Amino acid sequence: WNRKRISNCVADYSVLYNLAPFFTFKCYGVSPTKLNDLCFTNVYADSFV
Amino acid sequence: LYRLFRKSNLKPFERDISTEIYQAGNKPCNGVAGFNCYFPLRSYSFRPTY
Amino acid sequence: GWIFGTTLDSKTQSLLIVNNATNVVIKVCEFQFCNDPFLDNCTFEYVSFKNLREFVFKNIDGYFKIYSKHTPIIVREPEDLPQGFSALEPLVDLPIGINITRFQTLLALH
Ligand SMILES: *[C@@H]1O[C@H](CO)[C@@H](O[C@@H]2O[C@H](CO)[C@@H](O[C@@H]3O[C@H](CO)[C@@H](O)[C@H](O)[C@@H]3O)[C@H](O)[C@H]2NC(C)=O)[C@H](O)[C@H]1NC(C)=O
Numbered sequence: 001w002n003r004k005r006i007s008n009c010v011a012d013y014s015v016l017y018n019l020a021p022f023f024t025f026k027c028y029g030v031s032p033t034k035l036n037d038l039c040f041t042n043v044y045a046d047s048f049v
Numbered sequence: 050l051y052r053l054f055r056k057s058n059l060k061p062f063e064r065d066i067s068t069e070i071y072q073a074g075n076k077p078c079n080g081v082a083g084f085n086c087y088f089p090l091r092s093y094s095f096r097p098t099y
Numbered sequence: 100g101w102i103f104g105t106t107l108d109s110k111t112q113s114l115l116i117v118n119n120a121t122n123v124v125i126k127v128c129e130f131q132f133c134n135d136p137f138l139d140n141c142t143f144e145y146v147s148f149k150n151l152r153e154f155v156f157k158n159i160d161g162y163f164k165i166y167s168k169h170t171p172i173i174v175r176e177p178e179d180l181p182q183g184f185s186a187l188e189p190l191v192d193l194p195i196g197i198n199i200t201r202f203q204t205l206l207a208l209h
């Protein structure tokens with residue numbers, strides 16, 4: 001697993017909500033519509049098939 | 050059933066029983082449920098193993 | 100009487116107050132209103148030109164407050180408000196839990 005420790009940035013997922021080739025958006029612990037105003041130390045990104 | 054999507058904060062002691070689809074995206078839902086058209090009423094399905 | 104509500108389109112809650120000369124009917128039923136009444140989920144129900152009737156309606160903290168005053172007046176000019184002072188006593192307080200953006204009065208016809 002490639003744990004990408006992304007830091008020192010603000011989440012901007014509203015592009016993916018505004019584009020066709022991204023389909024599912026599920027969030028647990030935080031709201032799926034309230035993602036933009038959250039701040040984190042290290043977001044751990046993983047991407048698989 | 051628990052509400053998770055609503056347009057604004059509610060004034061104290063008020064009732065919302067509208068079951069219309071929340072307009073998350075710019076596209077109108079028009080009675081069609083999908084992604085960026087979120088239904089407000091959801092349940093956590095309480096179980097004794099929780 | 101009066102109909103209070105936001106859109107009044109039978110998709111949201113709407114307060115209805117109707118007087119029929121014997122009782123006062125106050126409901127929050129979301130049924131249709133058509134346009135004008137004629138005469139010869141319900142989560143709250145409450146059943147109770149010389150004349151001038153003054154009313155004050157306000158809606159704070161989920162409470163609908165109605166203040167009322169009744170007085171006999173004699174006027175010279177056609178339909179002008181009299182120059183005087185009258186204090187409106189409180190009439191009723193209702194815990195209906197709605198917000199109101201629009202309203203419309205109700206008339207009696209033949
Ligand atoms: C009064 O409120 C209810 C919900 O609070 C409104 O929704 C409708 O309620 C009826 C009665 O339960 C539903 O019909 C049946 O419900 C059962 C669940 O017990 C379900 O298994 C059946 O398949 C059937 O659907 C109905 O689905 C529900 N929704 C709609 C869109 O009608 C009701 O409309 C309110 N009535 C008034 C007059 O305001």
Ligand SMILES: *[C@@H]1O[C@H](CO)[C@@H](O[C@@H]2O[C@H](CO)[C@@H](O)[C@H](O)[C@H]2NC(C)=O)[C@H](O)[C@H]1NC(C)=O
Pocket residue numbers: 056057058059060105106198199200
């Ligand atoms: C009061 O009820 C209205 C329902 O009509 C809620 O939505 C407002 O609706 C009016 C009429 O279209 C709009 O002009 C407002 O902009 C809407 N409000 C918002 C915040 O967008 C309204 O939210 C309700 N008030 C509260 C405090 O929930």
Ligand SMILES: *[C@@H]1O[C@H](CO)[C@@H](O[C@@H]2O[C@H](CO)[C@@H](O)[C@H](O)[C@H]2NC(C)=O)[C@H](O)[C@H]1NC(C)=O
Pocket residue numbers: 119120121122124146
């Ligand atoms: C004015 O309206 C009220 C209520 O709308 C009427 O009250 C009725 O009272 C009887 C007495 O037992 C009840 O059985 C009925 O169910 C009530 N009506 C309703 C609709 O609930 C009252 O009679 C009306 N007065 C006149 C003169 O029409």
